[PDB]
PDB file of C-alpha atoms and ligand atoms in Angstrom:
ATOM      1  CA  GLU A   1     -14.146   4.529 -11.355  1.00 34.75           C
ATOM      2  CA  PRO A   2     -10.662   5.877 -11.845  1.00 34.64           C
ATOM      3  CA  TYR A   3     -10.277   9.611 -11.213  1.00 37.47           C
ATOM      4  CA  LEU A   4      -6.729   9.546  -9.775  1.00 36.49           C
ATOM      5  CA  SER A   5      -4.279   9.465 -12.688  1.00 37.27           C
ATOM      6  CA  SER A   6      -0.616   9.971 -13.577  1.00 38.66           C
ATOM      7  CA  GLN A   7      -1.510  13.499 -14.714  1.00 36.51           C
ATOM      8  CA  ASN A   8      -3.546  14.726 -11.707  1.00 35.28           C
ATOM      9  CA  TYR A   9      -1.730  13.059  -8.786  1.00 35.07           C
ATOM     10  CA  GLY A  10      -0.090  16.373  -7.789  1.00 37.60           C
ATOM     11  CA  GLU A  11      -3.488  16.818  -6.058  1.00 36.89           C
ATOM     12  CA  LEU A  12      -2.331  14.221  -3.529  1.00 39.26           C
ATOM     13  CA  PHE A  13       0.000  16.722  -1.838  1.00 36.78           C
ATOM     14  CA  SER A  14      -2.381  19.591  -1.190  1.00 35.55           C
ATOM     15  CA  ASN A  15      -4.512  20.714   1.771  1.00 38.85           C
ATOM     16  CA  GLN A  16      -7.325  18.130   1.569  1.00 39.37           C
ATOM     17  CA  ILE A  17      -6.954  15.018   3.729  1.00 40.17           C
ATOM     18  CA  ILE A  18      -6.833  12.049   1.333  1.00 41.27           C
ATOM     19  CA  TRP A  19      -6.715   8.325   2.164  1.00 41.29           C
ATOM     20  CA  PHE A  20      -5.914   5.414  -0.087  1.00 39.12           C
ATOM     21  CA  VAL A  21      -7.898   2.352   1.083  1.00 38.75           C
ATOM     22  CA  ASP A  22      -6.541  -1.049   0.043  1.00 39.34           C
ATOM     23  CA  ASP A  23      -8.791  -4.089   0.636  1.00 39.91           C
ATOM     24  CA  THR A  24      -6.766  -6.517  -1.517  1.00 36.80           C
ATOM     25  CA  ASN A  25      -5.556  -8.609   1.425  1.00 38.91           C
ATOM     26  CA  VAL A  26      -8.369  -8.400   3.971  1.00 33.85           C
ATOM     27  CA  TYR A  27      -9.422 -11.978   3.317  1.00 31.86           C
ATOM     28  CA  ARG A  28      -6.154 -13.789   2.840  1.00 30.12           C
ATOM     29  CA  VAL A  29      -4.679 -17.232   2.267  1.00 33.28           C
ATOM     30  CA  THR A  30      -1.194 -18.742   2.377  1.00 32.87           C
ATOM     31  CA  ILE A  31       0.202 -21.808   0.632  1.00 31.30           C
ATOM     32  CA  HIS A  32       0.901 -24.715   2.942  1.00 29.05           C
ATOM     33  CA  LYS A  33       1.834 -28.386   2.783  1.00 24.61           C
ATOM     34  CA  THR A  34      -0.607 -30.756   4.512  1.00 25.66           C
ATOM     35  CA  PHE A  35       2.023 -32.904   6.360  1.00 22.75           C
ATOM     36  CA  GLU A  36       0.434 -35.659   4.254  1.00 22.81           C
ATOM     37  CA  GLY A  37       2.599 -33.985   1.592  1.00 18.31           C
ATOM     38  CA  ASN A  38       0.119 -32.141  -0.604  1.00 18.79           C
ATOM     39  CA  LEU A  39       0.116 -28.478  -1.630  1.00 14.82           C
ATOM     40  CA  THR A  40      -2.949 -26.385  -0.847  1.00 16.81           C
ATOM     41  CA  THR A  41      -3.923 -23.124   0.856  1.00 19.14           C
ATOM     42  CA  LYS A  42      -5.156 -22.015   4.296  1.00 17.63           C
ATOM     43  CA  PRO A  43      -6.770 -18.735   5.445  1.00 16.35           C
ATOM     44  CA  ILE A  44      -4.526 -16.396   7.434  1.00 17.89           C
ATOM     45  CA  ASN A  45      -4.968 -13.010   9.070  1.00 18.32           C
ATOM     46  CA  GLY A  46      -5.414 -10.115   6.659  1.00 18.57           C
ATOM     47  CA  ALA A  47      -5.174  -6.332   6.901  1.00 15.19           C
ATOM     48  CA  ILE A  48      -6.709  -3.154   5.563  1.00 15.10           C
ATOM     49  CA  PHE A  49      -4.125  -0.557   4.555  1.00 16.05           C
ATOM     50  CA  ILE A  50      -5.292   3.028   4.881  1.00 15.76           C
ATOM     51  CA  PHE A  51      -2.649   5.548   3.749  1.00 16.55           C
ATOM     52  CA  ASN A  52      -2.328   9.364   3.784  1.00 14.29           C
ATOM     53  CA  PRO A  53       0.027  10.341   0.892  1.00 13.33           C
ATOM     54  CA  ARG A  54       0.974  13.742   2.350  1.00  9.50           C
ATOM     55  CA  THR A  55       1.705  12.859   5.992  1.00  9.79           C
ATOM     56  CA  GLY A  56       2.832   9.260   5.357  1.00  8.32           C
ATOM     57  CA  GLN A  57       0.414   8.021   8.005  1.00  6.76           C
ATOM     58  CA  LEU A  58      -0.580   4.379   7.683  1.00  7.38           C
ATOM     59  CA  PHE A  59      -3.581   2.958   9.559  1.00  8.36           C
ATOM     60  CA  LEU A  60      -3.134  -0.791   9.639  1.00  5.07           C
ATOM     61  CA  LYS A  61      -6.300  -2.657  10.574  1.00  4.40           C
ATOM     62  CA  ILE A  62      -5.541  -6.295  11.198  1.00  2.00           C
ATOM     63  CA  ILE A  63      -8.370  -8.654  10.303  1.00  2.00           C
ATOM     64  CA  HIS A  64      -8.308 -11.886  12.344  1.00  2.00           C
ATOM     65  CA  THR A  65      -9.665 -15.014  10.629  1.00  2.00           C
ATOM     66  CA  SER A  66     -12.409 -15.384  13.246  1.00  2.00           C
ATOM     67  CA  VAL A  67     -14.575 -12.880  11.303  1.00  2.00           C
ATOM     68  CA  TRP A  68     -14.980 -15.457   8.514  1.00  2.00           C
ATOM     69  CA  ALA A  69     -16.392 -18.199  10.772  1.00  2.00           C
ATOM     70  CA  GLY A  70     -19.634 -19.637   9.382  1.00  2.00           C
ATOM     71  CA  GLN A  71     -19.860 -17.170   6.511  1.00  2.00           C
ATOM     72  CA  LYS A  72     -20.243 -17.811   2.797  1.00  2.00           C
ATOM     73  CA  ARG A  73     -19.040 -15.524   0.002  1.00  2.00           C
ATOM     74  CA  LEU A  74     -15.955 -14.344   1.876  1.00  2.00           C
ATOM     75  CA  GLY A  75     -14.747 -12.201  -1.017  1.00  2.00           C
ATOM     76  CA  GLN A  76     -17.926 -10.107  -0.802  1.00  2.00           C
ATOM     77  CA  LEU A  77     -17.894 -10.021   3.008  1.00  2.00           C
ATOM     78  CA  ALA A  78     -14.309  -8.753   3.025  1.00  2.00           C
ATOM     79  CA  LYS A  79     -15.339  -5.713   0.930  1.00  2.00           C
ATOM     80  CA  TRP A  80     -18.308  -4.891   3.166  1.00  2.00           C
ATOM     81  CA  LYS A  81     -16.239  -5.362   6.323  1.00  2.00           C
ATOM     82  CA  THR A  82     -13.507  -3.101   4.954  1.00  2.00           C
ATOM     83  CA  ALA A  83     -16.090  -0.390   4.295  1.00  2.00           C
ATOM     84  CA  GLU A  84     -17.524  -0.854   7.785  1.00  2.00           C
ATOM     85  CA  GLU A  85     -14.074  -0.522   9.347  1.00  2.00           C
ATOM     86  CA  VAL A  86     -13.149   2.568   7.327  1.00  2.00           C
ATOM     87  CA  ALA A  87     -16.461   4.178   8.330  1.00  2.00           C
ATOM     88  CA  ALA A  88     -15.780   3.275  11.974  1.00  2.00           C
ATOM     89  CA  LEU A  89     -12.334   4.895  11.808  1.00  2.00           C
ATOM     90  CA  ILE A  90     -13.785   8.077  10.254  1.00  2.00           C
ATOM     91  CA  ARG A  91     -16.419   8.298  13.018  1.00  2.00           C
ATOM     92  CA  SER A  92     -13.730   7.794  15.693  1.00  2.00           C
ATOM     93  CA  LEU A  93     -11.781  10.822  14.418  1.00  2.00           C
ATOM     94  CA  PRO A  94     -12.510  14.488  15.189  1.00  2.00           C
ATOM     95  CA  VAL A  95     -13.970  16.330  12.173  1.00  2.00           C
ATOM     96  CA  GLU A  96     -10.654  18.096  11.477  1.00  2.00           C
ATOM     97  CA  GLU A  97      -8.874  14.748  10.971  1.00  2.00           C
ATOM     98  CA  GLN A  98     -11.573  13.131   8.798  1.00  2.00           C
ATOM     99  CA  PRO A  99     -10.679  12.541   5.135  1.00  2.00           C
ATOM    100  CA  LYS A 100     -12.246  14.589   2.343  1.00  2.00           C
ATOM    101  CA  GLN A 101     -11.307  12.031  -0.319  1.00  2.00           C
ATOM    102  CA  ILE A 102     -11.029   8.252  -0.293  1.00  2.00           C
ATOM    103  CA  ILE A 103      -9.152   6.632  -3.155  1.00  2.00           C
ATOM    104  CA  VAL A 104      -9.768   2.899  -3.496  1.00  2.00           C
ATOM    105  CA  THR A 105      -7.111   0.488  -4.700  1.00  2.00           C
ATOM    106  CA  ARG A 106      -9.927  -1.718  -6.132  1.00  2.00           C
ATOM    107  CA  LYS A 107     -13.206  -0.619  -7.793  1.00  2.00           C
ATOM    108  CA  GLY A 108     -15.062  -3.306  -5.838  1.00  2.00           C
ATOM    109  CA  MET A 109     -14.808  -0.966  -2.831  1.00  2.00           C
ATOM    110  CA  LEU A 110     -16.678   1.920  -4.489  1.00  2.00           C
ATOM    111  CA  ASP A 111     -20.259   0.818  -3.717  1.00  2.00           C
ATOM    112  CA  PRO A 112     -19.712  -0.631  -0.193  1.00  2.00           C
ATOM    113  CA  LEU A 113     -18.006   2.605   0.850  1.00  2.00           C
ATOM    114  CA  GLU A 114     -20.811   4.740  -0.648  1.00  2.00           C
ATOM    115  CA  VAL A 115     -23.346   2.834   1.449  1.00  2.00           C
ATOM    116  CA  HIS A 116     -21.386   2.939   4.745  1.00  2.00           C
ATOM    117  CA  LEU A 117     -20.433   6.622   4.232  1.00  2.00           C
ATOM    118  CA  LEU A 118     -23.980   7.718   3.455  1.00  2.00           C
ATOM    119  CA  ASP A 119     -23.809   9.927   6.574  1.00  2.00           C
ATOM    120  CA  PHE A 120     -20.617  11.605   5.249  1.00  2.00           C
ATOM    121  CA  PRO A 121     -22.085  12.847   1.927  1.00  2.00           C
ATOM    122  CA  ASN A 122     -19.296  15.315   1.085  1.00  2.00           C
ATOM    123  CA  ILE A 123     -16.531  12.704   1.229  1.00  2.00           C
ATOM    124  CA  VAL A 124     -15.457  11.992  -2.347  1.00  2.00           C
ATOM    125  CA  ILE A 125     -14.982   8.269  -3.011  1.00  2.00           C
ATOM    126  CA  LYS A 126     -13.052   7.560  -6.199  1.00  2.00           C
ATOM    127  CA  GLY A 127     -10.961   4.966  -7.991  1.00  2.00           C
ATOM    128  CA  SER A 128      -7.462   5.213  -9.407  1.00  2.00           C
ATOM    129  CA  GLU A 129      -5.873   4.687 -12.838  1.00  2.00           C
ATOM    130  CA  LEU A 130      -2.647   4.146 -10.909  1.00  2.00           C
ATOM    131  CA  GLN A 131      -1.854   0.916  -9.133  1.00  2.00           C
ATOM    132  CA  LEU A 132       0.061   1.523  -5.941  1.00  2.00           C
ATOM    133  CA  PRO A 133       0.834  -1.877  -4.410  1.00  2.00           C
ATOM    134  CA  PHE A 134       0.368  -1.313  -0.677  1.00  2.00           C
ATOM    135  CA  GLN A 135       0.126  -5.111  -0.535  1.00  2.00           C
ATOM    136  CA  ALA A 136       3.931  -5.127  -0.808  1.00  2.00           C
ATOM    137  CA  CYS A 137       3.896  -4.009   2.850  1.00  2.00           C
ATOM    138  CA  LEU A 138       3.162  -7.696   3.612  1.00  2.00           C
ATOM    139  CA  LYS A 139       6.686  -8.512   2.404  1.00  2.00           C
ATOM    140  CA  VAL A 140       8.166  -6.241   5.063  1.00  2.00           C
ATOM    141  CA  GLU A 141       8.830  -8.503   8.065  1.00  2.00           C
ATOM    142  CA  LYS A 142       7.647  -5.889  10.568  1.00  2.00           C
ATOM    143  CA  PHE A 143       4.172  -5.943   8.998  1.00  2.00           C
ATOM    144  CA  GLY A 144       4.083  -9.580   7.870  1.00  2.00           C
ATOM    145  CA  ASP A 145       4.945 -10.846  11.361  1.00  2.00           C
ATOM    146  CA  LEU A 146       2.566  -8.454  13.162  1.00  2.00           C
ATOM    147  CA  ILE A 147      -0.438  -9.433  11.010  1.00  2.00           C
ATOM    148  CA  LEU A 148       0.252 -13.153  10.982  1.00  2.00           C
ATOM    149  CA  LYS A 149       0.649 -13.390  14.776  1.00  2.00           C
ATOM    150  CA  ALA A 150      -2.454 -11.387  15.751  1.00  2.00           C
ATOM    151  CA  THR A 151      -5.004 -13.186  17.920  1.00  2.00           C
ATOM    152  CA  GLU A 152      -7.750 -10.551  17.567  1.00  2.00           C
ATOM    153  CA  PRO A 153      -8.547  -7.628  15.295  1.00  2.00           C
ATOM    154  CA  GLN A 154      -6.611  -4.461  16.080  1.00  2.00           C
ATOM    155  CA  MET A 155      -5.615  -1.130  14.581  1.00  2.00           C
ATOM    156  CA  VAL A 156      -1.906  -0.254  14.564  1.00  2.00           C
ATOM    157  CA  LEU A 157      -0.574   3.134  13.415  1.00  2.00           C
ATOM    158  CA  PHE A 158       2.632   3.530  11.369  1.00  2.00           C
ATOM    159  CA  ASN A 159       4.274   6.067   9.078  1.00  2.00           C
ATOM    160  CA  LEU A 160       5.589   4.873   5.713  1.00  2.00           C
ATOM    161  CA  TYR A 161       7.939   7.867   5.284  1.00  2.00           C
ATOM    162  CA  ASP A 162       9.961   7.358   8.493  1.00  2.00           C
ATOM    163  CA  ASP A 163      11.864  10.643   9.091  1.00  2.00           C
ATOM    164  CA  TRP A 164      12.119  11.641   5.393  1.00  2.00           C
ATOM    165  CA  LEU A 165       9.765  14.640   5.539  1.00  2.00           C
ATOM    166  CA  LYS A 166      12.396  16.490   7.566  1.00  2.00           C
ATOM    167  CA  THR A 167      14.425  16.868   4.354  1.00  2.00           C
ATOM    168  CA  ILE A 168      12.244  15.939   1.345  1.00  2.00           C
ATOM    169  CA  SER A 169       8.744  16.810   0.051  1.00  2.00           C
ATOM    170  CA  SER A 170       5.669  14.552   0.325  1.00  2.00           C
ATOM    171  CA  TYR A 171       5.920  14.150  -3.450  1.00  2.00           C
ATOM    172  CA  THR A 172       9.557  13.069  -3.258  1.00  2.00           C
ATOM    173  CA  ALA A 173       8.750  10.781  -0.277  1.00  3.20           C
ATOM    174  CA  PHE A 174       5.738   9.315  -2.113  1.00  2.00           C
ATOM    175  CA  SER A 175       7.934   8.695  -5.179  1.00  2.00           C
ATOM    176  CA  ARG A 176      10.533   6.929  -3.034  1.00  2.00           C
ATOM    177  CA  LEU A 177       7.833   4.857  -1.308  1.00  2.00           C
ATOM    178  CA  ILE A 178       6.246   3.793  -4.595  1.00  2.00           C
ATOM    179  CA  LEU A 179       9.634   2.724  -5.980  1.00  2.00           C
ATOM    180  CA  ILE A 180      10.174   0.659  -2.859  1.00  2.00           C
ATOM    181  CA  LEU A 181       6.678  -0.880  -2.864  1.00  2.00           C
ATOM    182  CA  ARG A 182       6.539  -1.700  -6.574  1.00  2.00           C
ATOM    183  CA  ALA A 183      10.064  -3.159  -6.514  1.00  2.00           C
ATOM    184  CA  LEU A 184       9.120  -5.361  -3.539  1.00  2.00           C
ATOM    185  CA  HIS A 185       5.915  -6.231  -5.372  1.00  2.00           C
ATOM    186  CA  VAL A 186       7.597  -7.494  -8.555  1.00  2.00           C
ATOM    187  CA  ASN A 187      10.901  -8.881  -7.204  1.00  2.00           C
ATOM    188  CA  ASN A 188      11.078  -9.241  -3.405  1.00  2.00           C
ATOM    189  CA  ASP A 189      14.562 -10.770  -3.453  1.00  2.00           C
ATOM    190  CA  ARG A 190      16.236  -8.179  -5.698  1.00  2.00           C
ATOM    191  CA  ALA A 191      14.535  -5.197  -3.990  1.00  2.00           C
ATOM    192  CA  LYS A 192      15.750  -6.274  -0.533  1.00  2.00           C
ATOM    193  CA  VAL A 193      19.320  -6.610  -1.865  1.00  2.00           C
ATOM    194  CA  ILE A 194      19.115  -3.067  -3.303  1.00  2.00           C
ATOM    195  CA  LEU A 195      17.716  -1.821   0.024  1.00  2.00           C
ATOM    196  CA  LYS A 196      20.757  -3.282   1.808  1.00  2.00           C
ATOM    197  CA  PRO A 197      23.708  -1.632  -0.031  1.00  2.00           C
ATOM    198  CA  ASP A 198      26.187  -1.983   2.832  1.00  2.00           C
ATOM    199  CA  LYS A 199      26.590  -4.840   5.312  1.00  2.00           C
ATOM    200  CA  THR A 200      26.057  -2.127   7.953  1.00  2.00           C
ATOM    201  CA  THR A 201      22.678  -1.114   6.540  1.00  2.00           C
ATOM    202  CA  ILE A 202      20.084  -1.258   9.312  1.00  2.00           C
ATOM    203  CA  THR A 203      16.519  -0.141   9.935  1.00  2.00           C
ATOM    204  CA  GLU A 204      15.826   1.637  13.232  1.00  2.00           C
ATOM    205  CA  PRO A 205      13.258  -0.124  15.473  1.00  2.00           C
ATOM    206  CA  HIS A 206      10.859   2.834  15.078  1.00  2.00           C
ATOM    207  CA  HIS A 207      11.231   2.871  11.298  1.00  2.00           C
ATOM    208  CA  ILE A 208       9.965   0.841   8.324  1.00  2.00           C
ATOM    209  CA  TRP A 209      12.864   1.437   5.922  1.00  2.00           C
ATOM    210  CA  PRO A 210      16.667   1.438   6.123  1.00  2.00           C
ATOM    211  CA  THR A 211      18.686   4.351   7.475  1.00  2.00           C
ATOM    212  CA  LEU A 212      20.543   5.580   4.384  1.00  2.00           C
ATOM    213  CA  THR A 213      22.495   8.720   3.496  1.00  2.00           C
ATOM    214  CA  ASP A 214      21.064  11.136   0.877  1.00  2.00           C
ATOM    215  CA  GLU A 215      23.623   9.784  -1.576  1.00  2.00           C
ATOM    216  CA  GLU A 216      22.715   6.137  -0.786  1.00  2.00           C
ATOM    217  CA  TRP A 217      19.010   6.882  -1.390  1.00  2.00           C
ATOM    218  CA  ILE A 218      19.780   8.324  -4.845  1.00  2.00           C
ATOM    219  CA  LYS A 219      21.578   5.108  -5.833  1.00  2.00           C
ATOM    220  CA  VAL A 220      18.829   2.940  -4.304  1.00  2.00           C
ATOM    221  CA  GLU A 221      16.141   4.867  -6.223  1.00  2.00           C
ATOM    222  CA  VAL A 222      17.997   4.434  -9.540  1.00  2.00           C
ATOM    223  CA  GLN A 223      18.413   0.693  -8.903  1.00  2.00           C
ATOM    224  CA  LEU A 224      14.762   0.214  -7.858  1.00  2.00           C
ATOM    225  CA  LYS A 225      13.552   2.114 -10.932  1.00  2.00           C
ATOM    226  CA  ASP A 226      15.901   0.001 -13.100  1.00  2.00           C
ATOM    227  CA  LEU A 227      14.491  -3.212 -11.558  1.00  2.00           C
ATOM    228  CA  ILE A 228      10.851  -2.145 -12.081  1.00  2.00           C
ATOM    229  CA  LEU A 229      11.414  -1.178 -15.744  1.00  2.00           C
ATOM    230  CA  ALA A 230      13.378  -4.361 -16.572  1.00  2.00           C
ATOM    231  CA  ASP A 231      10.735  -6.526 -14.938  1.00  2.00           C
ATOM    232  CA  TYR A 232       7.993  -4.658 -16.842  1.00  2.00           C
ATOM    233  CA  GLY A 233       9.913  -4.917 -20.090  1.00  2.00           C
ATOM    234  CA  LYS A 234      10.398  -8.656 -19.667  1.00  2.00           C
ATOM    235  CA  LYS A 235       6.731  -9.251 -18.707  1.00  2.00           C
ATOM    236  CA  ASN A 236       5.391  -7.187 -21.602  1.00  2.00           C
ATOM    237  CA  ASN A 237       8.129  -7.780 -24.189  1.00  2.00           C
ATOM    238  CA  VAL A 238       9.063  -4.116 -24.395  1.00  2.00           C
ATOM    239  CA  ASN A 239      12.686  -2.944 -24.639  1.00  2.00           C
ATOM    240  CA  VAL A 240      13.469  -0.540 -21.774  1.00  2.00           C
ATOM    241  CA  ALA A 241      15.539   1.674 -24.131  1.00  2.00           C
ATOM    242  CA  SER A 242      12.361   2.334 -26.160  1.00  2.00           C
ATOM    243  CA  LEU A 243      10.472   3.852 -23.210  1.00  2.00           C
ATOM    244  CA  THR A 244       9.700   7.579 -23.087  1.00  2.00           C
ATOM    245  CA  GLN A 245       9.976   9.560 -19.840  1.00  2.00           C
ATOM    246  CA  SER A 246       6.162   9.684 -19.643  1.00  2.00           C
ATOM    247  CA  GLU A 247       5.850   5.913 -20.138  1.00  2.00           C
ATOM    248  CA  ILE A 248       8.440   5.368 -17.423  1.00  2.00           C
ATOM    249  CA  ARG A 249       6.408   7.532 -15.004  1.00  2.00           C
ATOM    250  CA  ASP A 250       3.276   5.519 -15.822  1.00  2.00           C
ATOM    251  CA  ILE A 251       5.020   2.157 -15.292  1.00  2.00           C
ATOM    252  CA  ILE A 252       6.433   3.151 -11.851  1.00  2.00           C
ATOM    253  CA  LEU A 253       2.962   4.338 -10.820  1.00  2.00           C
ATOM    254  CA  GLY A 254       1.394   1.054 -12.010  1.00  2.00           C
ATOM    255  CA  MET A 255      -0.623   2.805 -14.736  1.00  2.00           C
ATOM    256  CA  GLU A 256      -1.401   1.028 -18.033  1.00  2.00           C
ATOM    257  CA  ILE A 257       0.626   2.231 -21.051  1.00  2.00           C
TER     258      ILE A 257
HETATM  259 CL1   CL B 301       5.355  18.649   0.553  1.00  2.00          CL
HETATM  260 NA1   NA B 302      -5.866   1.086 -10.334  1.00  2.00          NA
HETATM  261 NA1   NA B 303      18.633  11.212   6.101  1.00  2.00          NA
END
């Protein structure tokens, strides 16, 4: 499976078009109370996240619950549907915009993609030793509201780097994005506080993330990193002070240490 690693991910920022494909939340449920009072779940709209780490481009394919109607083994179906939708997107693009590499968030996507991309034999499909939680996008109201409200499947295009590439590298933007996503992933409440340093902190309507000065981003990034390491340390009973620089890099990236 896992070719992408914390020691070769510099590759991500070169000339080949690369997509991460996350199928984690294609078939999706929410917790709800039955009015009768009891706790249980109900299926809600899902999404495929398809992400280019150099450009910041996000293809968001909303999956309406109607696809599940009358089907068994929804976990399996979700994987096969994701592969079908990724293949469809590739075919819809001119050859010069088609990816050369697909990196799957989950190994379960390896085989379905191989089968659907049988007519694109030179596309490399690989797993990742990292664990980049694109699912944390669901905790961003913009995305959470859009997916939940959908009445039909649809593709919506976004960019997860906002205007950052005007002043910082893809690597630096990726590193910022991963800090944001992993922080949201592990502690939604604390991350959103960190991402709102001033009462005047706002996000532009055409953006995903707050408008912050260069200096404000530095502080945010320190605080997010601090949150991720403390959370990890608590979960794994490891003292943060004991961590090496390399271990810290691995933790942020979601890699096993
Ligand atoms: Cl760059
Ligand atoms: Na992984
Ligand atoms: Na700026």
